[PDB]
């Protein structure tokens, strides 16, 4: 009945002549390896790293005429992978690696089935830390795009193949949750088949697209620079024409919005441009600065010193009150309208 | 007397036909291994990564027939784990691993008892750092539910099956505290049997109902903003009428508020919706901007400027310190019975 | 003469019947094995993880019948711990490890010798991080008692025995200091054993009793704590019956207590229970929240508003200033001895 | 037809005396390995610790006569890496290496093709944080080069040589960007030959120039320090004599510019020398402390106590603020241009 | 002519009788061992941690008479590391390891090379994360001196002896320097025999004398709280009777020095002694708490209520503030030089 023990040493031992060393159809066509990854989990997203932690099932299926049994009765052996340091796999790795293991806890976290044909499933669960750039231009609506590129290191194009599967080359678990960001549905699946002075390898690569939950931000960075605005408002009502009050409501409303600004990128990574969230935290600040400089502008013309015209001189100190009471709530307004259809619009 | 130096390389080695590769009862029913897990020590429960470290003694029960003896007198053989590297093991692993490794201090730390009829018994020691998501909805009063799930990697339903014992398939240690915490004592235990294309793969998983301990944010987040509170009140009795300190002591509880705000969320995620400590320190915002607002109405009214009514013009702004006197401590006790009301009922 | 390459092969190779998986006195007594260790290094006592480091020296001493030789002369052989596989070895290990290691710089740090009748020292370096529960019901005054157990994993009482020796089992290095603590000469040395449903497993255990150095924190909390009551107490000097700088003053010493009160707790596990330097920060908080306190009941009765009554209407106002300038430092005078009482009657 | 699976054992194996403990050419010319570098990834350049990480692809080619072969018809043999351990390799390090690794996921990364007269080309990935010294004298400003250096470390300078190859021996990927430094295009290929009391050992060293992006520092550095200065000349227009105002505006200005300069500090190395971004925050920290100390200039003038000097004893208070609010836009505006004129003519 | 592949096998195998579990001079004089170390990198010396981590070539000399080759013609034999598991090896450790390893990129960092009468040199690439106690009395002007030690594991002292060599026995590399410290040129070369219960072993070791860079520290902790004591000096000037704003001065320097005071001590351990930058900010505390001390002396004088002796009532008021504008400046100056002799006669 051919038992077990001898068939798992009859196909790969020292007979029958099968040598890990050497890729099926030596000196022929190239050996054409198809992949589809499972994402388990997703996230740990840093943005001072500029790095994301992803924990995949890596499936790889090609094609060994070597290991085509026919006497066997039936049509898959899934196999105990203490036997894949005796097949040959492909030296398959990842361009952007940043450190990455393997899981080995109760077992090796590996899986081997072959097929009659010689059809070899190889399933392994690697965690990685990929590296993806950050484009960070507008910071709290953007689109991020990271990437994974799965190349080969030993052999050619000529000897080796990586391409992706038609049936839903990337599977993503049924509660895959993110706390900052969102997964979308279409993931782009091109090539980027590099070039050395070695030789040309093969290289396959999955987008990701990823959009931010915008809700976090509008609870500690917008908002709460939305009220000290409504703080620098609060000085054009007292006492209409001279008080130290609104020149200390104007000392203390920018020892926020210096903090706030500077707390705004507490971790961000020191990228060179200008982002959204720094022309909101320089533009609240103006609004700040502009209130503590619009009663300076009172006081020096209040305290500058008629016979008739001494009702009028407080009426040059009145009417800009009134303007700057009315005004800047049409300034921010209209600022506030071209900020986020600009942001909107992507 | 059948010395013990050669019977363990009897029923293990080259004679009898032990092949290690080859699980039991092969092209018949599936092996049904039985666990249950005892946990040490559980926690370091971070938010920012949203794990948690658990320490559990694997225990796992199967049945091998190729392993059952007959000669031997006694009941049990606790063996050496050098000899695990010599007989079947399931291929069990975490589904939220997220790393993890044993125990290799002084020796493996690992344990094999082998019965007459063939019951296994294979006990190791692991450290875990598993994954579960936050539900952080009501971050203060939450009860969390993190789980730990076991999957077979190799071997599809239909040749090794998982399941619990019913004799308290989680024990606990004695002492086992957690310092933000508490573990409750009823523990669910159900199946998560997944499907991929690969085929279908067991699984079993047990939930922990974690419980804040409530004590600490009373301490540092509730009772510090409800002093805050009573400073705004203290600007509603000096002077009744003007001052520049009852603006500067609405201008100072608005620099507390602002970064203790702030200071409520430094060590934790950053999601997307509002919990219950936000609308805490957000309401507790408001009545010391109304405060502010409400002495900025005062002195409005104040400086407005009759014949007789000079002396009601004082009146109309002494009724409105008489009823910003009294009525935030209701409109404040009115909201702090709506809020812990909510809070409780879950 | 016996060359010593060839002694080494004839007592522990395949000749006289030695097997390593086998314990000694096999189906008869236990194993005694008795335990002594050696501190090299102690500390990084953290108290948010509630784990402390220890470098000890295991040393481990059992008696092997099987390795009793009687043809060599001398009385011991320290040997290569190459041999260190090949010999039987307990299994020990640490019930609360959270990782641990060896020490494999340059050799393995291991030690072993073999007297005449087969008594076997076994001494080995271990780095360990170990887990002990901190009560920090009295913060900076405590006493804790950090243990370290030691169980077997494979074999149960009646196949192997811990015990610690009489001859001093717990020594300490020469110039062990400790930053913020000190370690107690007398270390308590008890059992702790185990009850599974596998089985009985044999522990022994060694408190270690650290006290704390109070010197650090009254160089930081209670000293910078102290002066900021006596500027709530330089407010009651000033003017004596109505100034702005008396709420300013009152104003800002209400923005340290509050920070200096979260700062108090920067560097700590966020425990339920209210512990020392709680109420000590929040105390302090209220003498000089009262400060503020009575100065806006001067100004409250002060400015109420006859003909002879009005110079006993300041002295309304200035009885309450004379009374709170000599009773505050009667109240907390008498708080302070019925502070540090408390806490040194631990 | 030469089978490929005995082709490897025959020039590797016992037959043809090839020991991989020999280096080629034995008591002859020295090994003359040649070796150019891909770089991946570059960055997390730390300036705390003064590390770098970098992901290299190393290349190493050398001639050994022994795996010359003739019989077999093609150019190359693109080999497994578990050849690897059987050929002679030199002996590189890196005299800077700061812990490093290989990357073995799904396989080692290791590259070996032997060419028929023997030249063995041999590539590997390896991640390194290599250490460089940062001279920080002119910090944003600054043009560091931080070097690589490839040593022998068992092999003389008589019997292993390397060099550097003609045909671009440093490359780099197509689309490597950093976030705060750029990669200059000129890159030095130098000697570095080290002498020891053991021998002479050859050294091969690249420098890489990284020039700093200056434009995160205008936004978080400079332009914040330089509203604050603008706020130290606000008080120079407010009543023109005397004002409590005009001292709380330059009371608030030195808590922003101490905070600021302490702030400015905080992920930076404890270097002993000043640096540009010192003495930026050191001078615009006087002309903050110079305004409070302008209108303290004022005030002992004007609180000083005549029949007709009177209105010149207010102009002796005017004088002086008519000065300072003119001179001191002039001698910022010359620091300004006197700061930056220095810093770029490096 | 002796080929080399047969002459390593020769004197190392299973022929001649050489055994690597055995020292040289077996039951004889003990093995001396001469050592010196190269130090590549020094560095990164925490004292939160108190640790320091090196990066050594730790070269050991021993003599092997079964090693002395006699018809080789050459005077050494520069060899693979791989032959390193098959001769004897002294079984160094250091004492103060806290965690250790090897370097292993592209070859084991390993050397080896016998001289002709058997004299063996053995070189190899440590990294070291030392401890060592900080002694901080005097904290920015101290003078550490931390070590390193290297003992014997399993060999006594009439077994194996640790020398260190007369010809230079520690060596520096070129262009070794450190942020924060300098490494003096005198370096002690003493010993640490230590005893134990099990043996005594052989220690010695090498004091490494550390000194500060003073540099950093004038520019972060002293000089911006010298500037601190010129604001305190400030409030002297100001209309010398009575202003909030000698208060309000009074009022936030000393909110700068409680938060620098703690600023401080951000990186520092937990020390229970007082140090040189503590008494440092403590004296420059009292300097800003007496200005507003003095300034509420002042205040209640003036506000205490003739007909003459109206005039003599604010010359008791002024005499005050022209002794604290001149003798300020001199105990300020006392207390500085007594601070810097007290601290440079060390
Ligand atoms: C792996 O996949 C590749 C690509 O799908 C296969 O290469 C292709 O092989 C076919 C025949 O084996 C080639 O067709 C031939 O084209 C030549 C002109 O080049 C012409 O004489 C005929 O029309 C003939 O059909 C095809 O060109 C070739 N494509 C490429 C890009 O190389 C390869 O055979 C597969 N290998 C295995 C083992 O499955
Ligand atoms: C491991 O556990 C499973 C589940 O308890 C066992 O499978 C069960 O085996 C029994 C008999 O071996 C099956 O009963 C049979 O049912 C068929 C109809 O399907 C009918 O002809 C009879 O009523 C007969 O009793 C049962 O259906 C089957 N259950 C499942 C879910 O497969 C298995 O035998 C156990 N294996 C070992 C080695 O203990
Ligand atoms: C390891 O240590 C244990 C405990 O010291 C030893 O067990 C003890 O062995 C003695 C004699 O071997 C027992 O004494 C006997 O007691 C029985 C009644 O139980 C009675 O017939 C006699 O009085 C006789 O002396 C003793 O009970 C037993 N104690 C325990 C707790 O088991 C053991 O022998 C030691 N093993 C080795 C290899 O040194
Ligand atoms: C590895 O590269 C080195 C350097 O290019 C080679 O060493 C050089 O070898 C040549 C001939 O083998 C030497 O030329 C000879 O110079 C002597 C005077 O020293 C004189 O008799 C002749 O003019 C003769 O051409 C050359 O000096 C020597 N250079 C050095 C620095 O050693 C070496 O041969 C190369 N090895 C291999 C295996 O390719
Ligand atoms: C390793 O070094 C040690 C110390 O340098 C050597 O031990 C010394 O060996 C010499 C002769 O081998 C001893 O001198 C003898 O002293 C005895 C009195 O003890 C006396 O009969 C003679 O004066 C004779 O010269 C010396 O005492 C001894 N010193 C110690 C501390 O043991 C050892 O020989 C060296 N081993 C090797 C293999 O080089």
Chains 1, 2, 3, 4, 5 share one sequence.
């Not at 054009?236 to 024409?241: A, G, R, S, T």
Request: proline share 5%; aromatic share 14%; charged share 20%.
């Amino acid at each position: 009945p051919m038992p077990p023990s001898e068939f798992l040493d009859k196909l790969m031992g020292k007979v029958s002549g099968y040598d890990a060393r050497i890729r099926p159809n030596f000196k022929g066509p190239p050996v054409n390896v198809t992949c589809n990854i499972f994402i388990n989990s997703f996230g740990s997203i840093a943005e001072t790293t500029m790095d994301y932690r992803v924990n995949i099932f890596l499936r790889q299926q090609w094609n060994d005429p070597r290991l085509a049994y026919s006497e066997y009765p039936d049509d898959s052996l899934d196999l105990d992978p203490s036997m894949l340091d005796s097949i040959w796999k492909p030296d398959l790795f990842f361009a952007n690696e940043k450190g990455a293991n393997f899981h080995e806890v109760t077992t090796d976290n590996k899986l081997l089935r072959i097929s009659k044909n010689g059809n070899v499933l190889y399933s392994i669960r690697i965690t990685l830390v990929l590296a993806c750039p950050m484009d960070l231009k507008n910071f709290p609506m953007d689109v991020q795009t990271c990437i994974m590129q799965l190349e080969s290191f030993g052999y050619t194009m000529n000897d080796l193949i990586f391409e992706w599967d038609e049936k839903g080359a990337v599977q993503v678990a049924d509660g895959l949750t993110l706390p900052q960001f969102i997964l979308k549905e279409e993931k782009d699946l091109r090539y980027c088949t590099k070039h050395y002075n070695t030789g040309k390898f093969t290289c396959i690569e999955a987008r990701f697209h990823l959009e931010r939950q915008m809700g976090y931000y509008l609870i500690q960075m917008y908002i709460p620079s939305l009220l000290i605005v409504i703080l620098s408002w609060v000085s054009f009502w007292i006492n209409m024409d001279a008080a130290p009050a609104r020149v200390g409501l104007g000392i203390t409303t920018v020892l926020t919005m210096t903090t706030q600004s500077s707390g705004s990128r507490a971790s961000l990574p020191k990228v060179s441009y200008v982002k959204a969230i720094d022309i909101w935290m320089a533009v609240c600040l103006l609004f700040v600065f502009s209130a503590l400089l619009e009663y300076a502008a009172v006081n020096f013309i209040a305290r500058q010193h008629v016979e008739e015209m001494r009702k009028l001189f407080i009426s040059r100190a009145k009417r800009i009150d009134t303007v700057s009471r009315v005004a800047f709530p049409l300034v921010f307004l209209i600022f506030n309208i071209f900020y986020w259809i600009t942001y909107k619009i992507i």
